[PDB]
From a paper:
Tpp80Aa1 from Bacillus thuringiensis is a Toxin_10 family protein (Tpp) with reported action against Culex mosquitoes. We report the first crystal structure of Tpp80Aa1 at a resolution of 1.8 Å, which shows Tpp80Aa1 consists of two domains: an N-terminal β-trefoil domain resembling a ricin B lectin and a C-terminal putative pore-forming domain sharing structural similarity with the aerolysin family. We also identify that Tpp80Aa1 can interact with galactose-containing glycolipids and galactose, and this interaction is critical for exerting full insecticidal action against mosquito target cell lines. Here, we demonstrate an expanded target range, showing Tpp80Aa1 is also active against the larvae of Anopheles gambiae and Aedes aegypti mosquitoes.
Our final model had an Rwork/Rfree of 0.17/0.21 at 1.8 Å resolution and showed Tpp80Aa1 packs into the crystal lattice as homodimers, which could be indexed in the monoclinic space group C 1 2 1. The electron density map showed continuous density for residues 5–355 of the 373 aa wild-type Tpp80 protein sequence. Within each Tpp80Aa1 monomer, two distinct conserved domains appear: an N-terminal ricin B-lectin domain (IPR035992) spanning residues 5–155, and a C-terminal Toxin_10 domain (IPR008872) spanning residues 156–355. In the Tpp80Aa1 homodimer structure we also see the presence of two calcium ions (1 per monomer) and five buffer molecules present in the crystallization solution; four bis-tris propane and one citrate. The final model shows the presence of a homodimer with a large molecular interface forming an ‘X’ structure. In the case of Tpp80Aa1, PDBePISA interface analysis identified 12 interfaces; the largest interface (1010.9 Å2) between the two monomers in the ‘X’ shape involves 34 residues of monomer 1 and 35 residues of monomer 2, with 13 hydrogen bonds. Whereas the large Tpp1/Tpp2 interface may be preserved in solution, this is unlikely to be the case for the Tpp80Aa1 dimer—indeed SEC indicates Tpp80Aa1 is largely monomeric in solution. As Tpp80Aa1 does not need a partner to elicit toxicity, it is possible this ‘X’ shape is a requirement for packing and stability in the crystal structure. A structure reminiscent of an aerolysin insertion loop is present in Tpp80Aa1 between residues 259–272 (SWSIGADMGFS), as a short β-hairpin—with predominantly amphipathic structure—tucked under a loop. In Tpp80Aa1 we see a similar conservation (D73, Y88, S96, and E97) where the sidechains superimpose with those present in Tpp78Aa1, and we propose this as the putative galactose binding site of Tpp80Aa1.
Residue numbers in the entry: 5 to 354
The structure:
């Protein structure tokens, strides 16, 4: 049930011993899913399996870059199985893999509760793939999931976040910024990225760039430095959050943005990937439709000492970007400051 990211898979029907295939090596929406005898190197018979929310999988064709789908979102017996572009919010594109005792799988629609099937128990080339109600004895509903060779995934080196700078003396000049370090990344399939180098060409995109890397880079930025006299109160203002421009870059690239609660706000072609994104980039799922904006905060500092007190304030900066196989960036990064992750450092220490 834990299939491998970047492993090419073929689906061998128990009854026919023939393979899930896209009719005519077609690239377009609504192209028929059929069975066809084993071919040594036809990409139309190979699929990536990408894990989705709630332990479903996307079945992504290596020729088309489109996914296994139910024609017209039908819930009935005999409804046709086709390919269609990954939408995210289409339950007919989500598949649950039930393992049987002999190692075959039954492949159940999230939408319909019916399973992949060969129409009429047919054994011939080009026999149609449909959905049918789950049946205890129906070898036409059983598929062997066979590894057909794995593809290298992009990678980047991660490390711990820099610590917040501290005063050793009242005279120390604390840095404007710490080193920028990658604290997390996640590998997402091409279905997850709208890349202007490919536009709507899903076939060319999956052939050249089947997997992208979403990178999270973080550092501390100094907002304020001041030395308070004894008895001094120092008041100041900060601007935090994210530019509308940067939210638009996130939305058009990976179809998520930053919620007002600092969580990931998922919609469209990022739906189904909320668990992977939140877990692997170590950021909560947003509990709000409200989007983070630039906001102004008011701050005060009072000096509790009978001597001068040095004061700096640091805020956590997070930059996200999407990296191609070839190391280039899709669109541009988006950058936020988190008002809920700010630290004051003083000398003497408080
Ligand atoms: Ca079909």
């Amino acid at each position: 049930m834990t299939f491998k990211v970047g492993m090419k898979y073929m689906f061998k029907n128990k009854n026919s011993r023939k393979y899930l295939d896209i009719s005519g090596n077609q690239t377009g929406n609504n192209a028929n899913v059929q069975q066809y005898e084993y071919l040594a190197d036809a990409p139309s018979e190979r699929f990536f399996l990408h894990p989705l929310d709630n332990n479903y999988y996307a079945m992504i064709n290596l020729n088309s870059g489109k996914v296994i789908d139910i024609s017209g979102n039908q819930t009935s017996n005999n409804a046709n199985i086709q390919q269609y572009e990954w939408l995210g919010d289409a339950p007919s594109e989500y598949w649950y893999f039930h393992r049987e005792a002999d190692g075959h799988y039954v492949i159940e629609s999230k939408h319909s509760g019916k399973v992949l099937d060969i129409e009429g128990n047919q054994t011939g080339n080009n026999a149609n793939v449909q959905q049918y109600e789950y049946l205890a004895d129906a070898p036409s509903e059983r598929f062997a999931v066979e590894e057909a060779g794995s593809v290298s995934l992009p990678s980047i080196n991660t490390q711990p976040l820099s610590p917040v700078p501290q005063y050793e003396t009242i005279n120390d000049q604390l840095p404007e910024e710490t080193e920028r370090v990658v604290t997390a990344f996640t590998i997402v399939p091409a279905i997850s990225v709208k890349d202007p180098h490919y536009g709507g060409d899903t076939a060319k995109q999956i052939k050249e760039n089947p997997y992208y890397m979403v990178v999270k880079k973080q550092w501390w930025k100094k907002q304020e430095s001041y030395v308070l006299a004894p008895s001094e109160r120092y008041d100041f203002v900060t601007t935090t959050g994210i530019r509308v421009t940067d939210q638009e870059t996130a939305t058009k690239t990976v179809s998520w943005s930053i919620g007002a609660d600092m969580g990931f706000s998922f919609k469209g072609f990022s739906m189904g990937m909320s668990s992977q994104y939140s877990q692997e980039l170590q950021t909560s799922i947003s509990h709000t439709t409200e989007q983070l904006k630039e906001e102004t905060q008011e701050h005060h500092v009072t000096n509790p000492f009978l001597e001068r007190m040095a004061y700096s304030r640091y805020i956590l900066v997070t930059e996200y970007y999407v990296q191609r196989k070839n190391g280039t960036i899709v669109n541009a990064p988006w950058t936020m400051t988190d008002k809920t992750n700010a630290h004051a450092v003083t000398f003497p220490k408080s």
